[PDB]
Amino acid sequence: KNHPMLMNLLKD
Amino acid sequence: RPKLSEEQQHIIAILLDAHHKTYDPTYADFRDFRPPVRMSPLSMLPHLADLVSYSIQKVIGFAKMIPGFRDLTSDDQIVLLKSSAIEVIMLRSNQSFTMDDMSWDCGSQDYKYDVTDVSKAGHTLELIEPLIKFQVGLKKLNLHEEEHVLLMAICIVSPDRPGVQDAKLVEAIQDRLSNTLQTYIRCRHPPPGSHQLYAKMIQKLADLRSLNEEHSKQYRSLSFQPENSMKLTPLVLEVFGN
Ligand SMILES: CC(C)(c1ccc(OC[C@@H](O)CO)cc1)c1ccc(OC[C@H](O)C(C)(C)C)cc1
Known part of the structure; x- marks a missing residue:
């Protein structure tokens, strides 16, 4: 599903 | 003969x-x-x-x-x-x-929150009563900070969350933390506080599933009227639902 903000907060 | 390995100490x-x-x-x-x-x-x-x-x-x-x-x-x-x-x-x-x-x-009176504050965010005792009961039972455990941080990490890495794909991997990660917690209690947590401490901690995770279910219900009810949704943040909407 589309979670751009969570995705960005998780990235290395 | 339980002993905290170097790896386990590293995890903590x-x-x-x-x-x-x-x-x-x-x-x-x-x-x-x-x-x-x-x-x-x-x-x-x-x-x-x-x-x-x-x-x-x-x-x-x-x-x-x-x-x-x-x-x-x-x-x-x-x-x-x-x-x-x-x-x-x-x-x-x-x-x-x-x-x-x-x-x-x-810290301050302004940032001191009671049951009425939480009800003024749109919640009822269906949530807040079990929530307060949870907070009380947790505080009484008087967890070491080591135990508290482990419990939070174990809560996060749970294999039965709906939608998990690699359940086996999620379980393997959690197991290493579970084993780390159990060994910590045995070696560093003295009796009587240590009695059944692991089981009581896991019980708090079950209590959390029930709290999460009820929070979600009251949240879906709150977030139902767009005027209320408007007052949330983009991260809240994305994480809790829209
Ligand atoms: C009371 C409680 C547990 C809390 C949450 C976070 C807190 O922060 C700092 C603490 O970590 C410092 O130790 C303090 C209290 C809370 C729970 C759910 C809420 O939900 C409101 C609505 O459901 C939204 C729509 C705003 C999400 C509000 C407060």
């Missing part, structure tokens, strides 16, 4: 530091939130929405630092955080919770 040192880098016991950032309002209809919502949104950020920061969490797929990382966020927020908040007046005391 990392989780401790992770927690330190994501929980500010000075509560200095609370000034950045929309102001608390207490005196009718959802007056605490903008403030507690901001606090909760801030809290989601800190929880993601903590989860990223959990040994093995980074080995999961981006999908699974997302699933675990969306489903655990509220629970880890309830757990981590125990640190400011006080049995004196049954409130979360974040």
Whole structure:
């Protein structure tokens, strides 16, 4: 599903 | 003959530091939130929405630092955080919770939150009564910080969260933390406080599933009227649902 903000907060 | 391996000690040192880098016991950032309002209809919502949104950020920061969490797929990382966020927020908040007046005391009177404050964010005793009971039972455990950080990490890395793809991997990561916690209790937690401590901690995770279910219901009810949704943050909407 589309979670751009969570995705960005998780990235290395 | 249980002994804390070097790896297990390493896990505890990392989780401790992770927690330190994501929980500010000075509560200095609370000034950045929309102001608390207490005196009718959802007056605490903008403030507690901001606090909760801030809290989601800190929880993601903590989860990223959990040994093995980074080995999961981006999908699974997302699933675990969306489903655990509220629970880890309830757990981590125990640190400011006080049995004196049954409130979360974040430094000042303005940032001291009681049952009516939480009801003025749109909640009822269907949630708040089990929530307070949980906070009480957790505080009474008088967890070592080592135990607290382990419990938060175990909560996050749970294989039965709906939507998990690599369940076996999620279980293997959690098992290493579960084993680390159990050994810690045996070696570092003295009796009588240690009696059944592991089982009691896991019981708190079951209590959290029930709290999460009820929070979600009341949230879906709150977030139903677009006028209320408008008052939330983009992160809250994305993480808790839209
Ligand atoms: C009371 C409680 C547990 C809490 C959450 C986070 C807190 O932060 C700091 C603590 O970590 C310091 O130790 C303090 C208290 C809470 C739970 C759910 C909420 O939800 C409101 C609505 O459901 C939204 C729509 C705003 C999400 C509000 C407050």
